[PDB]
């Protein structure tokens with residue numbers, strides 16, 4: 001179609017800007033998932049990006065942890081409004097923290113991401129990360145306002161594990177990956193994934209990388225204007241906040257099933273996607289969030305899904321509720337600064353795609 005051609009052109013233009021590679025999966029109503037790629041999986045080997053290359057999805061993981069949690073709500077063992085003192089009795093302010101605040105970025109919890117060394121081989125524990133957060137972050141009052149929280153999701157993961165008696169990867173695999181045939185999806189803290197299949201991730205030595213969000217010391221020198229950051233950070237360090245590995249294809253599988261109502265009942269899905277308040281994420285198109293899903297605005301279209309930033313892999317997934325379209329776009333270029341083109345600019349091709357879809361429907 002002319003749509004195919006416009007979309008490939010969008011991805012082509014984006015890599016021509018200096019993005020190493022990009023992988024897209026897009027499903028439209030009444031149609032199969034279409035896959036598109038441009039540029040390279042591996043910059044130095046000049047290996048072409050395919051629909052089978054795996055990426056670290058970063059915070060897109062949170063949508064799966066939220067889903068996992070809401071599933072345990074359905075099982076009747078968890079209440080979205082009950083205090084987390086049940087699982088975390090000695091956690092400061094826990095009595096003011098209902099289960100839901102862990103998912104909605106309004107808990108005031110101290111965060112760990114900006115203090116955590118991104119270059120490391122340390123195997124982290126969920127509790128280590130929690131203790132590390134309280135050591136290095138600033139805690140605010142629950143319900144102070146929205147401030148993006150990775151710690152809330154780590155604690156969510158710990159609930160999943162206590163309520164099921166196994167690592168949270170087991171719950172996500174049996175209740176989500178298996179039933180939907182997501183065969184190319186892994187949970188990084190608790191599962192070994194095949195590195196040889198992963199697209200390489202690239203941090204760019206860019207001029208607009210002024211205020212890096214990460215401790216990226218120990219990097220060494222850039223080759224051809226980039227670092228290969230694929231294996232800088234062990235995924236256990238992100239844990240339930242960003243440890244998943246997947247393909248745009250598998251992500252769209254998840255997204256179709258979620259919005260179709262084939263995972264969560266009507267009430268848990270409404271909670272995830274419709275029970276919303278305003279939300280900010282620096283550099284991004286985020287305007288609101290629910291309990292596991294961000295609302296990201298692209299002119300006259302909006303996606304409900306998530307963004308993900310983990311060194312070298314930059315992702316946007318979501319569902320446009322008006323058009324029915326589900327998408328996951330991951331590039332293997334990034335930087336440290338939220339406002340860098342290599343981070344924030346992942347939104348440009350996304351915006352262009354939603355407007356091309358719109359055109360072909362007008």
Ligand SMILES: NC(=O)[C@@H](N)Cc1ccccc1
Nearest residue numbers: 058059113238241242308309
């Ligand atoms: N926006 C993101 O995708 C990152 N917060 C994911 C992440 C969590 C924890 C550590 C590193 C990375």
Ligand SMILES: [Ba+2]
Nearest residue numbers: 209210211212
């Ligand atoms: Ba500086």
Ligand SMILES: [Ba+2]
Nearest residue numbers: 120121231232
């Ligand atoms: Ba390492």
Ligand SMILES: [Ba+2]
Nearest residue numbers: 299300301322
């Ligand atoms: Ba509109």
Ligand SMILES: [Ba+2]
Nearest residue numbers: 359360361362
């Ligand atoms: Ba037209």
